[PDB]
Design a protein around this ligand. Structure first.
Ligand SMILES: CCCCCCCCCCCCCCCCCC(=O)OC[C@H](COP(=O)([O-])OCC(O)COP(=O)([O-])OC[C@@H](COC(=O)CCCCCCCCCCCCCCCCC)OC(=O)CCCCCCCCCCCCCCCCC)OC(=O)CCCCCCCCCCCCCCCCC
Ligand SMILES: CCCCCCCCCCCCCCCCCC(=O)OC[C@H](COP(=O)([O-])OCC(O)COP(=O)([O-])OC[C@@H](COC(=O)CCCCCCCCCCCCCCCCC)OC(=O)CCCCCCCCCCCCCCCCC)OC(=O)CCCCCCCCCCCCCCCCC
Ligand SMILES: CCCCCCCCCCCCCCCCCC(=O)OC[C@H](COP(=O)([O-])OCC(O)COP(=O)([O-])OC[C@@H](COC(=O)CCCCCCCCCCCCCCCCC)OC(=O)CCCCCCCCCCCCCCCCC)OC(=O)CCCCCCCCCCCCCCCCC
Ligand SMILES: CCCCCCCCCCCCCCCCCC(=O)OC[C@H](COP(=O)([O-])OCC(O)COP(=O)([O-])OC[C@@H](COC(=O)CCCCCCCCCCCCCCCCC)OC(=O)CCCCCCCCCCCCCCCCC)OC(=O)CCCCCCCCCCCCCCCCC
Ligand code: HEA
Ligand code: HEA
Ligand SMILES: CCCCCCCC/C=C\CCCCCCCC(=O)OC[C@H](COP(=O)(O)OCCN)OC(=O)CCCCCCC/C=C\CCCCCCCC
Ligand SMILES: CCCCCCCC/C=C\CCCCCCCC(=O)OC[C@H](COP(=O)(O)OCCN)OC(=O)CCCCCCC/C=C\CCCCCCCC
Ligand code: CUA
Ligand SMILES: [O-][O-]
Ligand SMILES: [Cu+2]
Ligand SMILES: [K+]
Ligand SMILES: [Mg+2]
Ligand SMILES: [Zn+2]
Ligand SMILES: [Zn+2]
Ligand SMILES: [Zn+2]
Lengths: 124, 459, 107, 61, 226, 65, 180, 121, 65
């Protein structure tokens, strides 16, 4: 349809490049940090690249913060079991901080015996 | 611009973003519940403020269902890929798509504002009268939120139905999943609106439908006539995602595509006629109970066919491909988890078994395994599959075996013990309980704190 | 059900006794996060992203034809991340039939 | 009548086919944002006060 | 096409008020320099001038007659382009079905850009497979990984422009002898006399050549109120 | 334009201002506070304490603390 | 080998947190004054004037792209005539090392293989039948038990005593016949 | 049995061992696995077997561990997860000695039956 | 909702419906239950205690109380 929204248009050329006064190319913000740590592992994974192709995807330690570089360096079945227990222990610790020294009377031996008497009478 | 944008893909991102935000409030409420239930006594809620707990459980349920999982699986992933799957330039109704997300946000603000300003009382997310109609103004505010949410849901359903008129390719299984959910919404929402209006009439217009000589059981019929179709409006989009992920990642064409599609249609029709399995203990007639029990058990047939068709998709796939991707793990975990939830659903479907297990934490664990585990994981798996297309970053999820393992283990620590206390028995919607149920409640509570900690490791 | 294309024995007969199955690698290569140069501005980083699309890649066979990146669904056919306007030219789903008309041929 | 002189149909969104008139309507409603915030904030204060939520501390002092 | 909406009134003819008022320059403008409205009225004025002169039609060749009416004599180059244009337009709102593609005769995928998304469904019957989508970029002979169906991209590109009916007419049509205004006047007097106008377009056109307002009733015709 | 090809181009090209991310996280944090702050306020309103002491609604031993 | 060392040089560690100096040291919020960059800020992001305040979709800076002849600029293909034939050479994407960084060597081999399809139509049809009717059998196996237990609850019994139970907020009232 | 009775156009390996080879492997190092069973540096290609000489369709199988550790490797040369072991070595052995296979399977099932019955009962 | 798990009873106490439930206790004891329908603030604080005694004992109790 003459004068309608074009099906295809070519991109205009990009705006002029900016140099610094000394000739250094002007750099712009980039959120791709080079984290500082001693880990240098490189993990590669065969990945689906459609139906008939694959791609060898690599993860580099320097692309990740220290915490992940440390964890991802160890064997999974060395870390995983320790982490599982640790998280569970921490949860219990957190839930015990608010009840330190709490001693309800219904958990004393005297109350425990009285319930046994009630159960005997009621054949519970 | 930000709020003015009509781009269907941008709006899809907004839906996911808002679901995570509102989700933070949802998870916080869940932590309050589990903390309280850690032992017997009062832990974080005073005995004089027990009304707050009733409000916490009510808002938890409502927010997670209508403001988090539904906006995420029926608004987020659908608005981003459906027009692409349909090889169409954009969504049929651009302006309607914009207002729908704005409506969801505005209804969320109303709800949370009502927490802050109104007296905090609760009546469950099922808003049973007469309790719902003898409450304070916070109930009125919640009703406004639901009605407003209903407007967004119906207009979004209209939007997806119009794709049939413009689709330029083949209706894939996922597209069929959304269309049928849209049909379920168009047929169920108008009934919900009517019963909600009657709740308002009794709250605000001196109506007498829910006082003596008026049957309160009437509400439960009309509510659950929408209620159960809602649980399938929340699961069917998840099924559609699972089909795409398994076929794509395993490089295998969907097996029994037409049976998958006809299974989704069947689940919808059946799901529209089985609502009274939520009303087994009211005292319905013997023949009604037998009809509903019979038809409820039938839903397993079409649901079972889909499960087995998924299994053969993963079977036989090439070994060279790395299988530790988070999206693939979540998709597989869904099959393993959904079977647990569904089987327990069949158990509760037997009404005589249900007499013992109604209003107990067995029901909780049942719908958590499907929603809190299955639906959440399906939404995560779908977003993860579209990470390159969506383009988000600054998270460590795509390849994180620790996150998947820890999540699976700890989520089961929360809800598996809730099946046990269902035969103990521990009623639902309670905060205090007998001292002999502490062990299992404590174990589940330890599971809840742990799951939250694992949510921090993704960043 | 689909079980592949049908093969006649005549089509399995080689023209040489040394013919074997071509060993061409269909792994596209080693990849990672797309790495932008700091010097590049927003426009030039857009060009960089457009040049890293896996769905624009292919494998060339011994006879010069190329097998492209293919997907079951069109979701994998748009640029990653998805641009604002994707399918300006309507994607064409090609159907095959045995019907023909004389106008298409010449003697 | 010349087909190539109507490109504003797709170059400009329909909501702003009216030029300054349509831009003015949007701008006028934009001016009402903060007045709305004050009005809405007042309603929250009204409910908060009527529920005696300001006397939380004075109640027990 | 089925995807087009209803014919406009303009699709049949244009109002005489859209005739350019500088007819003298209009009839001397080269075709490449005439816009859509100018080209419409150049062809209509010149075409109707020859058609409304019966005594000269039998001695006029089809080559000359077609030129006067503005019709392009067809040839293999222009036919190819026009055909591929109409095939592109048809595929905008129609299905894409045809014979199985081979190296000798690849599936032809028309496009304006350098790429078009295409799906292969395989052969007929049991040879049909699930949709395999691929991006068809120019300069490569694509082969489906499943059925070995050969595809190829055809680009409607000519000299920094895509193919349009206007482009085809400009590139291949050649302007003939310059239109003579004497013919316009001669035919005008033939069908327009004594307050009877049987060539309205030639009455308006002659008026403009005269300077606008010269012929009887034309000042009243050009005087509007809003 | 090349800058307009991608939706949310600044974020996708990794040039966005970090404040946008901070606001998103802050918004989520505020949403979470809507469950905790009214809990504290309501507890004090009906009891006089912001949070209870575990099992302070039950009989406690003399040495309980 | 370590592939990261190949493109270590390209990745120079950063100096500023989030890649920007304090606004005081350099005002990245202002529009750039560089010619041809009026639509960009100093840091390279699009300016609010270009995208919001004077967005072209709202009628600002009206400039129709299409020309009089209904044409727009289109870049042609790379044509190479040869062997009595006009050929088009397709544009090949740059090496993935340039765009991603890793050196494209020692790539693992993933051969071409046609789709992994399930065969033996007769066998497959029987499995699909079982995928549907094995659950159907189980449901039928529960149906009879369900009817019986439902009938059992709703059985007319010769009850000899009645206890009336009323539920109130929040206690249970019980009414029982008193011995005569 | 795909190579034995179904398809005669894929290379057929020789069984080096009906038991996996235990080897210590290091992350960031590439290993080459013998797919013909005739290498004298099992489980690796020795430079003189069919795989090394690219003879008869045999090629070395590239493999790389994600983490350091001890990994099991296929000796039967037919495991589905080759080069890694998943139990196919035992399965292929049962095909070659079906009487022995029954003995082991009965013994394994006998133990499993006793333990599960003893605990549940 | 009147729930006594040991007696296999869970009947909703709905206004307007007087639901009939038949039971036959086989052993003596005390069977504890709780309200099973969210009923307001103290839904968790209205338990259901039923004690089954011998018929001779029940008659004496009823005669005195
Ligand atoms: C005497 C009296 C007589 C009678 C008088 C009667 C008068 C009658 C008047 C009637 C009319 C009144 C109303 C007029 C409305 C006018 C609308 C209009 O035309 O605007 C055009 C106008 C166009 O602006 P412009 O002049 O061109 O320039 C705008 C700027 O350049 C900015 O450009 P921009 O638009 O690109 O930027 C927008 C964007 C820019 O983006 C950002 O700020 C950063 C990026 C996002 C950060 C992450 C946010 C979280 C993720 C959200 C994900 C979902 C997003 C969904 C889409 C957005 C929905 C808002 O940020 C925002 O402004 C909002 C972002 C989202 C905020 C909400 C996120 C969730 C927070 C949850 C927290 C709690 C939990 O629209 C706007 O841009 C602003 C519209 C504002 C509407 C506000 C409505 C708020 C309602 C809240 C609830 C109300 C009840 C309770 C309130 C309680 C208060 C205490
Ligand atoms: C008709 C027609 O022309 O449809 C296409 C036509 C569009 O024209 P087109 O260009 O040919 O479309 C291209 C195809 O979409 C592209 O399709 P395709 O070429 O890829 O595939 C061929 C075929 C593919 O589709 C089929 O062939 C499917 C045909 C079967 C559909 C399922 C039927 C229901 C299940 C069986 C029930 C048995 C009951 C037995 C009772 C026995 C009692 C004795 O296409 C269609 O049939 C397309 C239309 C599908 C319409 C679906 C409408 C909703 C279905 C809802 C199902 C039931 C939900 C129950 C919910 C709960 C209720 C309590 O559809 C419309 O005009 C759409 C209008 C939507 C209006 C929505 C609002 C209604 C109020
Ligand atoms: C479940 C959780 C875990 C999930 C784990 C799994 C996740 C899997 C992955 C999921 C991925 C989903 C898809 C992601 C797609 C992302 C696309 C994207 O980035 O779009 C670009 C989009 C915008 O980028 P852009 O294109 O550059 O936008 C430029 C702007 O439009 C224009 O720039 P501008 O600078 O001109 O912007 C205007 C700016 C101007 O801003 C400024 O000037 C800011 C100045 C500083 C203010 C800072 C806050 C101050 C707060 C003070 C509080 C004081 C309290 C005092 C208390 C005293 C008590 C005594 O803003 C405004 O003017 C309006 C701001 C409104 C929004 C913020 C509202 C905050 C809360 C307000 C609450 C109010 C309550 C009132 C109650 C009243 C009751 C009466 O990005 C964002 O908006 C940020 C997204 C960041 C996250 C992306 C996802 C990453 C992956 C997930 C990470 C995990 C997240 C977990 C949830 C959060 C947990 C907390
Ligand atoms: C002689 C040895 C066996 C002795 C016992 C035999 C007893 C008689 C069985 C019948 C006759 C067997 C004859 C076999 C002769 C060989 C035939 C043949 O072709 O040989 C070659 C053939 C393999 O040759 P190949 O394919 O060439 O390659 C060699 C590879 O080794 C490839 O190997 P593969 O892929 O075939 O590997 C086998 C693997 C293949 O399968 C897998 O690996 C699948 C594993 C998927 C796990 C997904 C995650 C699940 C996590 C769920 C957590 C839920 C928590 C929350 C629950 C909440 C509940 C409220 O099997 C398993 O891992 C066993 C999975 C069994 C089901 C798991 C679920 C149990 C649920 C229990 C009840 C739970 C109730 C509560 C829940 C709710 C209920 C509604 O060998 C076999 O077929 C071996 C089969 C071995 C089966 C062992 C089963 C042991 C586990 C029993 C269940 C666990 C509890 C026990 C107490
Ligand atoms: C998406 C969420 C979801 C899903 C999918 C389901 C699915 C099912 N639910 Fe639902 N359900 C809820 C969410 C969900 N439910 C919620 C949230 C509540 C409580 C609301 C409230 O009370 O407040 C609830 C409550 C609920 C009850 C009420 C119990 C009570 O109130 O005491 C019952 C009982 O009939 C029930 C039954 C079922 C059944 C029979 C299915 C079926 O869909 C399950 C089908 C799946 C399978 C059966 C497994 C897969 C199939 C096979 C493996 C084939 C082989 C199996 C067989 C042959 C049996 N559900
Ligand atoms: C889909 C809805 C949903 C979800 C996710 C959850 C999640 C959880 N729920 Fe759920 N819950 C309900 C819906 C949901 N719940 C409903 C409807 C009720 C009944 C209401 C009533 O009784 O009135 C209920 C009741 C309920 C109770 C009963 C309180 C009572 O009435 O006595 C308890 C505590 O035992 C509980 C705990 C939890 C926990 C610990 C989690 C989770 O925290 C477990 C851990 C999992 C996560 C923390 C991940 C969740 C993440 C997301 C949801 C965001 C996903 C977003 C994207 C992927 C973009 N829930
Ligand atoms: C989806 C659209 C079709 C839905 C059809 C649902 C019909 C299910 C039939 C269930 C049935 O047997 O009805 C009994 C049941 C009531 O049973 P009792 O309370 O025990 O009373 C019986 C004698 N006093 O009926 C109902 O509640 C029917 C409710 C009306 C449904 C109307 C749906 C309208 C859809 C448009
Ligand atoms: C400590 C609790 C957790 C804090 C946390 O993770 O906040 C993250 C969040 C987002 O920060 P980045 O992910 O670094 O985004 C900037 C661009 N990269 O940080 C903030 O919002 C900072 C303010 C948090 C206030 C919490 C109250
Ligand atoms: Cu009464 Cu609950
Ligand atoms: O609800 O099932
Ligand atoms: Cu239900
Ligand atoms: K408690
Ligand atoms: Mg109930
Ligand atoms: Zn094909
Ligand atoms: Zn070898
Ligand atoms: Zn082996």
């Amino acid at each position: 349809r003459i004068g309608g929204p074009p099906v295809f248009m070519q991109f205009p050329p990009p705006p002029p490049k900016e140099y610094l006064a000394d000739g250094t190319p002007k750099t712009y913000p980039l959120h791709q940090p080079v984290f500082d740590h001693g880990y240098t592992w490189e993990h590669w994974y065969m990945t689906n690249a459609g139906v008939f192709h694959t791609v060898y995807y690599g993860e580099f330690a320097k692309d990740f913060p220290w915490r992940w570089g440390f964890v991802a360096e160890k064997p999974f079945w060395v870390g995983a079991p320790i982490l599982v227990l640790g998280v569970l222990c921490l949860g219990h610790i957190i839930q015990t901080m608010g009840q330190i020294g709490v001693r309800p009377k219904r958990y004393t031996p005297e109350w425990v015996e009285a319930t046994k008497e009630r159960e005997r009478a009621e054949n519970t | 611009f930000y709020i003015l944008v009509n781009n269907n893909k941008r709006i899809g991102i907004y839906y996911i973003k808002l679901s995570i935000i509102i989700g933070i409030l949802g998870i916080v409420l869940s932590y309050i519940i589990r903390v309280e239930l850690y032992n017997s006594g009062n832990r974080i809620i005073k005995y004089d403020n027990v009304n707050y707990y009733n409000m916490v459980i009510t808002l938890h349920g409502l927010l997670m269902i209508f403001y988090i999982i539904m906006p995420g699986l029926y608004g987020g992933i659908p608005l981003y890929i459906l027009p692409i799957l349909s090889v169409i330039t954009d969504i049929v109704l651009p302006r309607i798509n914009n207002i729908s997300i704005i409506i969801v946000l505005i209804s969320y603000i109303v709800v949370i504002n009502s927490i802050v300003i109104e007296y905090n009382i609760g009546t469950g997310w099922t808003l049973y009268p007469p309790l719902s109609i003898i409450g304070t103004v916070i109930v009125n505010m919640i009703l406004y939120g639901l009605i407003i949410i209903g407007i967004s849901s119906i207009i979004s359903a209209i939007n997806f139905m119009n794709i049939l008129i413009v689709i330029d390719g083949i209706i894939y299984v996922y597209i069929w999943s959304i269309i049928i959910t849209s049909v379920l919404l168009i047929i169920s929402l108008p009934i919900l609106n009517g019963i909600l209006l009657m709740i308002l009439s009794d709250i605000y217009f001196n109506s007498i439908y829910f006082i003596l000589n008026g049957d309160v059981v009437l509400y439960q019929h009309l509510f659950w006539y929408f209620g159960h179709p809602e649980v399938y409006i929340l699961i069917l989009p998840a099924f559609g995602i699972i089909s795409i992920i398994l076929s794509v990642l395993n490089n295998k064409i969907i097996f029994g595509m037409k049976s998958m599609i006809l299974a989704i249609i069947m689940i919808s029709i059946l799901g529209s006629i089985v609502w009274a399995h939520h009303i087994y203990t009211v005292g319905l007639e013997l023949d009604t109970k037998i009809y509903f029990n019979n038809l409820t058990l039938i839903i397993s047939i079409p649901t079972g066919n889909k499960i087995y068709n998924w299994i053969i998709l993963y079977i036989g796939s090439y070994n060279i491909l790395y299988n530790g991707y988070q999206s693939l793990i979540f998709s597989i975990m869904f099959i393993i988890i959904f079977i647990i939830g569904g089987i327990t659903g069949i158990i509760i479907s037997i009404d005589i078994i249900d007499i013992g297990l109604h209003d107990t934490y067995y029901i909780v664990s049942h719908f958590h395994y499907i929603l809190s585990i299955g639906a959440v994981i399906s939404l995560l798996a779908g977003i993860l599959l579209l990470k390159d297309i969506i383009g988000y970053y600054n998270v460590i999820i795509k390849i994180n075996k620790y996150f998947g393992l820890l999540l699976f283990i700890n989520i089961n620590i929360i809800f598996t013990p809730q099946f046990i206390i269902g035969f103990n028995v521990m009623p639902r919607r309670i905060l205090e309980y007998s001292d002999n149920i502490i062990v299992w409640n404590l174990i589940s509570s330890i599971g809840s704190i742990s799951t939250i900690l694992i949510l921090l490791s993704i960043f | 059900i689909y079980e592949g294309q049908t093969v006649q024995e005549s089509e399995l007969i080689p023209q040489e006794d040394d013919w074997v199955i071509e060993e061409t690698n269909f792994c596209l290569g080693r990849n990672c996060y797309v790495r932008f140069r700091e010097e590049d501005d927003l426009a030039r980083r857009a060009l960089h992203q457009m040049d890293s699309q896996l769905n624009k890649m292919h494998t060339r066979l011994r006879d010069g034809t190329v097998i492209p990146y293919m997907s079951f669904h069109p979701d994998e056919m748009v640029d990653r991340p998805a641009p604002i306007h994707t399918f300006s030219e309507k994607p064409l789903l090609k159907w095959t039939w045995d019907e023909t008309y004389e106008e298409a041929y010449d003697d | 009548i010349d087909p190539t002189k109507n490109q504003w149909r797709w170059c400009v969104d329909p909501a702003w086919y009216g030029g300054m008139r349509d831009k003015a309507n949007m701008d006028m409603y934009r001016l009402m944002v903060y007045p709305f915030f004050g009005y809405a904030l007042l309603y929250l204060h009204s409910r908060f006060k009527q529920n005696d939520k300001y006397n939380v501390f004075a109640k027990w002092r | 096409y089925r995807h087009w909406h209803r014919m406009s009134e303009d699709d049949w003819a244009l109002p005489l008020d859209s005739m350019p008022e500088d007819v003298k320059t209009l009839m001397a403008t080269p075709q490449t320099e005439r816009g859509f409205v100018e080209d419409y009225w150049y062809n209509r004025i010149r075409g109707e001038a020859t058609l409304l002169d019966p005594e000269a039609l039998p001695s006029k060749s089809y080559i000359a007659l077609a030129r006067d009416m503005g019709l392009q004599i067809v040839d293999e180059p222009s036919s190819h382009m026009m055909g591929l244009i109409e095939l592109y337009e048809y595929l905008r709102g129609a299905s894409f079905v045809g014979p199985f593609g081979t190296i000798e005769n690849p599936v032809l995928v028309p496009a304006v850009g350098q790429e078009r998304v295409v799906a292969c469904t395989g052969g007929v019957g049991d040879e049909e497979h699930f949709t395999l989508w691929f991006r068809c970029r120019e300069g490569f002979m694509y082969r489906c990984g499943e059925c070995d169906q050969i595809f190829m991209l055809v680009r409607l590109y000519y000299e920094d422009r895509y193919w349009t009916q206007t482009l085809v007419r400009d590139t291949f049509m050649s302007d003939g002898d310059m239109f003579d205004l004497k013919t316009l006047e001669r035919v005008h007097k033939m069908w327009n006399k004594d307050e009877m106008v049987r060539w309205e377009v030639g009455y308006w056109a002659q008026d403009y050549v005269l300077g606008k307002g010269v012929l009887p009733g034309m000042v009243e015709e050009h005087t509007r109120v809003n | 334009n090349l800058e307009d090809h991608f939706d949310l181009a600044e974020y996708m090209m990794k040039m966005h201002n970090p404040m946008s991310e901070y606001l998103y996280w802050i918004a989520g944090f505020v949403s979470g506070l809507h469950g905790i702050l009214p809990l504290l306020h309501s507890n004090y309103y009906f009891s006089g304490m912001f949070l209870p002491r575990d099992n302070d609604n039950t009989q406690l031993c003399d040495d309980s603390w | 080998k370590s592939y990261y060392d190949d493109f270590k040089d390209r990745l120079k560690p950063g100096k500023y947190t989030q890649g920007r100096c304090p606004q005081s040291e350099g005002d990245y919020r202002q529009e750039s004054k560089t010619i041809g960059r009026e639509h960009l800020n100093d840091d390279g992001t699009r300016s609010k004037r270009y995208t919001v305040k004077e967005a072209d979709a709202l009628g600002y800076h009206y400039h129709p792209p299409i020309d009089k002849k209904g044409q727009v600029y289109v870049k042609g293909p790379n044509t190479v005539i040869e062997r009595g034939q006009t050929w088009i050479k397709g544009y090949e994407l740059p090496s993935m090392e340039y765009t991603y960084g890793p050196k494209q060597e020692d790539i693992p081999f993933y051969p071409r293989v046609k789709l992994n399809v399930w065969g033996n139509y007769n066998l497959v049809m029987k499995v699909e039948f079982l995928f549907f009717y094995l659950p159907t059998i189980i449901v039928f196996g529960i149906c009879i038990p369900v009817y019986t237990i439902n009938f059992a609850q709703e059985e007319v019994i010769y009850t000899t005593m009645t206890v009336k139970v009323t539920g109130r907020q929040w206690y249970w009232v019980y009414e029982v016949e008193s011995p005569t | 049995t795909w190579t034995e009775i179904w398809w005669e156009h894929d290379p057929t390996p020789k069984v080096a061992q009906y038991r996996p080879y235990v080897c210590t492997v290091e992350s960031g190092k590439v290993y080459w696995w013998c797919a013909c069973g005739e290498s004298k540096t099992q489980p690796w290609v020795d430079g003189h077997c069919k795989c090394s000489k690219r003879e008869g369709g045999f090629r070395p199988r590239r493999w790389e561990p994600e983490h350091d550790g001890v990994r099991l490797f296929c000796g039967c040369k037919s495991c589905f997860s080759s080069p890694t072991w998943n139990g196919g070595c035992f399965t292929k052995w049962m095909q070659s000695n079906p009487a022995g296979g029954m003995l082991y399977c009965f013994a394994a099932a006998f133990g499993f039956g006793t333990l599960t019955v003893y605990r549940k009962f | 909702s009147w729930s006594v798990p040991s007696l296999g009873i869970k009947c909703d106490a709905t206004p307007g419906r007087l639901v009939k439930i038949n039971t036959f206790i086989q052993r003596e004891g005390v069977f504890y239950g709780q309200c099973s329908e969210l009923c307001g603030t103290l839904h968790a604080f209205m338990p259901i205690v039923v004690e089954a005694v011998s018929p001779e004992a029940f008659a004496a109790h009823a005669k005195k109380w």
